[PDB]
Design a protein around this ligand. Structure first.
Ligand SMILES: CS(=O)(=O)N1C[C@H](C(=O)Nc2ccc(Cl)c(F)c2)[C@@H](C(=O)Nc2ccc(-n3ccccc3=O)cc2F)C1
Ligand SMILES: [Ca+2]
Ligand code: NA
Lengths: 44, 234
């Protein structure tokens, strides 16, 4: 977890994500489940 | 906010504004979910009755996306006191759920150990709000944001007239004229990790605003992640 956050997109090798996110196939990236996921700036 | 800049469309969607009986903003909040707003305990003392406005970027103009919510339940930390300003945290449950849209979306809550090790050790965070633009001046009618560096705890304690507790952290600038101010209190301090913003602080207090040799003091949200979780489950 020390080096590059364990390559994790969010929480840390065992990665995980915040509510409203699913951990990706690669087991590192996080995929949002809804149009307005937490902690993302909104676009039109 | 002293210094900083107006938030661009969608840039600060987790911002909430507590409005008093005179329909005037007096404190900020952070959207945590469709039902919960995070704010400072000390804000609750400033208005007998208040509502929450989301989606507003300019308090002088009604623009699309603004909505008003009544508060159903106020959950103030039982250890907050004005003597020390320690435990300066509250959660508001709203009567009706917020509809997420452009300019209206929650900030992420992090996990405690990860946040302590990875978020808080970042260089900077972002503070936002509609508070005073100068210490002795008027509140901003436009939503402003400001990047504020994390400041070393010991440096901050040396600078402060008051005790800095483990439930607080410091951020901002020694002498540069940029800081949060009164009226921003209760609002969000967020830290970006990669492309996600996580709530790391609640705008709490400071001696004046943007004073040379003083910093802004924030409630350290990591200290209260269990408390928040318990508050949001009732
Ligand atoms: C001059 S002003 O414009 O009228 N205004 C600006 C100050 C401010 O809040 N600035 C501010 C600046 C930066 C940030 Cl981040 C932030 F939230 C706020 C506010 C103040 O003096 N606050 C203050 C000062 C001290 C304690 N405190 C702390 C510990 C123990 C006891 C104790 O009373 C509590 C306080 F509310 C007065
Ligand atoms: Ca408006
Ligand atoms: Na300062």
């Amino acid at each position: 977890c020390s080096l590059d956050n364990g390559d994790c997109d969010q929480f840390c090798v065992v990665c995980s994500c915040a509510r409203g996110y699913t951990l990706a196939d690669n087991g590192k990236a996080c995929i949002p489940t809804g149009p307005y996921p937490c902690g993302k700036q909104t676009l039109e | 906010i002293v210094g900083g800049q107006e938030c661009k469309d969608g840039e600060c969607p987790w911002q909430a504004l507590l409005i008093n009986e005179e329909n005037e903003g007096f404190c900020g909040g952070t959207i945590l979910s469709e039902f919960y707003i995070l704010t400072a305990a000390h804000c609750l003392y400033q208005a007998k009755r208040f509502k929450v406005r989301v989606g507003d970027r300019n308090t002088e103009q009604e623009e699309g996306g603004e909505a008003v919510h009544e508060v159903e339940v106020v959950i103030k930390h039982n250890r907050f006191t004005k003597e020390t300003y320690d435990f300066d945290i509250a959660v508001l449950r709203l009567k009706t759920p917020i509809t997420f849209r452009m300019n209206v979306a929650p900030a992420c809550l992090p996990e405690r150990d990860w946040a302590e090790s990875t978020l808080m050790t970042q260089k900077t965070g972002i503070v936002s709000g509609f508070g005073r633009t100068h210490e002795k001046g008027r509140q901003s009618t436009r939503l402003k944001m400001l990047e504020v560096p994390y400041v070393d705890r010991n440096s901050c304690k040396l600078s402060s007239s008051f005790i800095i507790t483990q439930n607080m952290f410091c951020a901002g600038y020694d002498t540069k004229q940029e800081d949060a101010c009164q009226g921003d209190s209760g609002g969000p301090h967020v830290t970006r990790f990669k492309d996600t913003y996580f709530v790391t602080g609640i705008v709490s207090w400071g001696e004046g605003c943007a004073r040379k040799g003083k910093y802004g003091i924030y409630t350290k949200v990591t200290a209260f992640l269990k408390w928040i979780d318990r508050s949001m489950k009732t």
